[PDB]
Design a binder for this molecule. Structure first.
Ligand SMILES: CCn1c(-c2cc(N3CCN(C)CC3)cnc2[C@H](C)OC)c2c3cc(ccc31)-c1csc(n1)C[C@H](NC(=O)[C@H]1C[C@@H]1C)C(=O)N1CCC[C@H](N1)C(=O)OCC(C)(C)C2
Ligand SMILES: Nc1nc2c(ncn2[C@@H]2O[C@H](COP(=O)(O)OP(=O)(O)NP(=O)(O)O)[C@@H](O)[C@H]2O)c(=O)[nH]1
Ligand SMILES: [Mg+2]
Lengths: 164, 170
């Protein structure tokens, strides 16, 4: 059972920056991996295409996935607006980790973050479900547009996305 | 020119720190939850017939980062200590917040206002008398507010400015 792979084509104020690909750990977190996979293909009629990375904090992470409100508060999963924390087997071990954003226990939706550093204090609180495969330097390049509180200085969008 | 006052809004997650600040600054309320990292705002206001400039720091209630509050408590001149009237734990967190401010300022006399927010909601769990008594024991004002209806929002921030003024001129 090969873990699935998805891609984002990132744009900065509408101009291409490059492609990031992710391995999704369906072997360990199948429900969370499947949510992200389906949102990347848009096959449920909604998903990540066209949404932005609303919070980028250099030294820590790039966060996105709010495709319902486009303001950092929204998003929804393929299972409903929220779903439970599947497990905390995998840890935030370093740059490239892909993990679920949440507003407390059992509130996963569609928002996610990509680590640009090890963020060990998030272990046990956010569900890790994937990692960057290709294009980590694109994620690093996205940090150029972040700030201390995460507000971005350019519109960082997922211009296209899908499954490889 | 006009005097600038450095205000800092503190309290547990979800009590309404951001909703109160955005009501003050931008005159609106949305019920969406956008948990704060850290935000700064500016607004000029007339208080007691004089114009002054409010510089407001809206802080995160995240318990995980409680050891990173010290730098902003050092720079802040006065503190809005916010709890929600329907959240007993947020009221119990108040003591811990005030104690932290006292330690960083190394003073028992720090400009501060106790704010009981969400007073538009039924099923209150923290009684007004219980909160007035605690503010009485601290020697600071207590104001009940609603970021949703705007009740007490201006009064909370203006009262804190008056407290800072009195402390500076003491
Ligand atoms: C003290 C200042 N601060 C800091 C902080 C922490 C440090 N440390 C240095 C020493 N090491 C050992 C410990 C940490 C240094 N510098 C800062 C920042 C740069 O100082 C301004 C953070 C933070 C997070 C929140 C609030 C205040 C915060 C917060 C507020 S809502 C939140 N977290 C969780 C967030 N939910 C949402 O969005 C919900 C709405 C959606 C659905 C969420 O799922 N994710 C994903 C994981 C990352 C997290 N967002 C986030 O953005 O983390 C920011 C980060 C910088 C990583 C941590
Ligand atoms: N009914 C009612 N809801 C309120 C009031 N103030 C805030 N809320 C709601 O309570 C939730 C949390 O508000 P918010 O201002 O984000 O709280 P916060 O203290 O800034 N949270 P954090 O520490 O995570 O940044 C939001 O859904 C908001 O609409 C109020 O006076 N009345
Ligand atoms: Mg807030």
């Amino acid at each position: 059972m090969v873990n699935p792979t998805v891609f984002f084509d990132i744009a900065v104020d509408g101009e291409p920056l490059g492609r990031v690909s992710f391995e999704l750990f369906a072997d360990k977190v199948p429900k969370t991996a499947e949510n992200f996979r389906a949102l990347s293909t848009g096959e449920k009629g909604f998903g990540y295409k066209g949404s932005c990375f609303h919070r980028i904090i250099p030294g820590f992470m790039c966060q996105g996935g709010d495709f319902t409100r486009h303001n950092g508060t929204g998003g929804k999963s393929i299972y409903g607006e929220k779903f439970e924390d599947e497990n905390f087997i995998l840890k935030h071990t370093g740059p490239g980790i892909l993990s679920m954003a949440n507003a407390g226990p059992n509130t996963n939706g569609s928002q996610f973050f990509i680590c640009t550093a090890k963020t060990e204090w998030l272990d046990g609180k956010h569900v890790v479900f994937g990692k960057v495969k290709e294009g980590m330097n694109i994620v690093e390049a996205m940090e150029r547009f972040g700030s201390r509180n995460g507000k971005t200085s350019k519109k960082i969008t997922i211009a296209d996305c899908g499954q490889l | 020119s006009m005097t600038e006052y450095k205000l800092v809004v503190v309290g547990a997650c979800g009590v309404g720190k951001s909703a109160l600040t955005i009501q003050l600054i931008q005159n609106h309320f949305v019920d969406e939850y956008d948990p704060t990292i850290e935000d700064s705002y500016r607004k000029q206001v007339v208080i007691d017939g004089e114009t002054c400039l409010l510089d407001i720091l809206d802080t995160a209630g995240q318990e995980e980062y409680s050891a990173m509050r010290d730098q902003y408590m050092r720079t802040g001149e006065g503190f809005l200590c916010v709890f929600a009237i329907n959240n007993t734990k947020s009221f119990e967190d108040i003591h811990h917040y005030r104690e932290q401010i006292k330690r960083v300022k190394d003073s028992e006399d720090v400009p501060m206002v106790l704010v009981g927010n969400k007073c538009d909601l039924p099923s209150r769990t923290v009684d007004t008398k219980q909160a007035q008594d605690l503010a009485r024991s601290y020697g600071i004002p207590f104001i009940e507010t609603s970021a949703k209806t705007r009740q007490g929002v201006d009064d909370a921030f203006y009262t804190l400015v008056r407290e800072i003024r009195k402390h500076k001129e003491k």
